[PDB]
Amino acid sequence: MEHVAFGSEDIENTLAKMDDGQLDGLAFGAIQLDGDGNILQYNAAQGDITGRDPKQVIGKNFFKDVAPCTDSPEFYGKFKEGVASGNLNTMFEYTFDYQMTPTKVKVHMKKALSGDSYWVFVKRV
Numbered sequence: 748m749e750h751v752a753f754g755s756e757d758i759e760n761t762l763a764k765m766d767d768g769q770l771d772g773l774a775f776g777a778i779q780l781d782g783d784g785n786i787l788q789y790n791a792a793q794g795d796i797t798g799r800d801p802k803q804v805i806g807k808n809f810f811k812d813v814a815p816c817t818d819s820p821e822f823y824g825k826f827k828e829g830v831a832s833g834n835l836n837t838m839f840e841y842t843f844d845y846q847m848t849p850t851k852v853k854v855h856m857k858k859a860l861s862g863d864s865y866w867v868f869v870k871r872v
């Protein structure tokens with residue numbers, strides 16, 4: 748394992764050092780998005796929750812293609828405001844239900860240390 752706790756105050760500093768292989772060692776799902784919602788990184792734990800193959804969704808748009816159940820003011824809406832503002836740090840519960848058994852999760856969205864990249868962290872609840 749990579750020991751990093753979900754919701755940690757400095758998590759963006761910690762994950763700045765990880766290559767895709769290290770992200771696969773986290774205890775929770777991790778997705779890196781650009782400012783347009785395109786998927787830059789997607790880890791193994793996220794594929795285990797949603798059944799998506801990580802290598803197959805890199806490059807796709809999260810909100811438009813992969814995860815349209817998040818295309819809502821409660822999720823996408825918060826993301827877009829955060830990108831527009833250049834600051835994002837929010838946690839909420841959500842249900843993932845697109846082409847899968849409905850799965851209640853905790854979502855943590857946070858701006859990355861780098862310019863135009865954003866993290867989505869996910870864990871089961």
Ligand SMILES: *C(=O)/C=C\c1ccc(O)cc1
Binds near residue numbers: 844
């Ligand atoms: C809502 O769209 C649920 C499905 C889904 C699929 C993949 C990811 O990563 C999140 C949500």
